[PDB]
């Protein structure tokens, strides 16, 4: 499972950089995840693990990894052939619960991604709506 370990290295190396994360570093992470597509389940698992465990300033970067991988895979393998979005959708509620533990000023950056996902049909709207509701309810509490 060499391909996964290279992805794991790229993903974890986010900790060596102060957010905002560069286009270039995001690309490296994404290139690594695509190269590991035989183990896409393990990639999704590592990403979900990073998001659960990382410092608060890294939650939005973790979300950008999901966005970046999903979009690249749809571009590279076809919208309807993409394995990553359907796989990420399985634990997405749990994932966003962890993402919303980000700094106050970072909540809006998560909604921006959700709005883009909805606009560009990246995830099914039925998947996206409760995630948006979650962000809204956070502002009333």
């Amino acid at each position: 499972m060499e391909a996964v370990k290279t992805f794991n290295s790229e993903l974890y190396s986010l900790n060596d950089y102060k957010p905002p994360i560069s286009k270039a570093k995001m690309t490296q992470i994404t290139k690594a995840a695509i190269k590991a597509i035989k183990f896409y389940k393990h990639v999704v698992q590592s990403v979900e693990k990073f998001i659960q465990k990382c410092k608060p300033e890294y939650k939005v970067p973790g979300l950008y990894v999901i966005d970046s991988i999903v979009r690249q895979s749809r571009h590279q393998f076809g919208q309807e052939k993409d394995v990553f979005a359907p796989r990420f959708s399985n634990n997405i509620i749990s994932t966003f619960q962890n993402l919303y533990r980000c700094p106050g000023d970072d909540k809006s950056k998560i909604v921006r991604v959700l709005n883009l996902w909805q606009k560009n049909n990246v995830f099914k709207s039925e998947i996206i709506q409760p995630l948006l509701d979650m962000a809204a309810a956070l502002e009333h509490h």
Binding site: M26, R71, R74, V113
Partner: peptide
């Protein structure tokens, strides 16, 4: 990174 930035070729 920008979530509107075109995917790499």
């Amino acid at each position: 990174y920008s979530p509107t930035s075109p995917s790499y070729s």
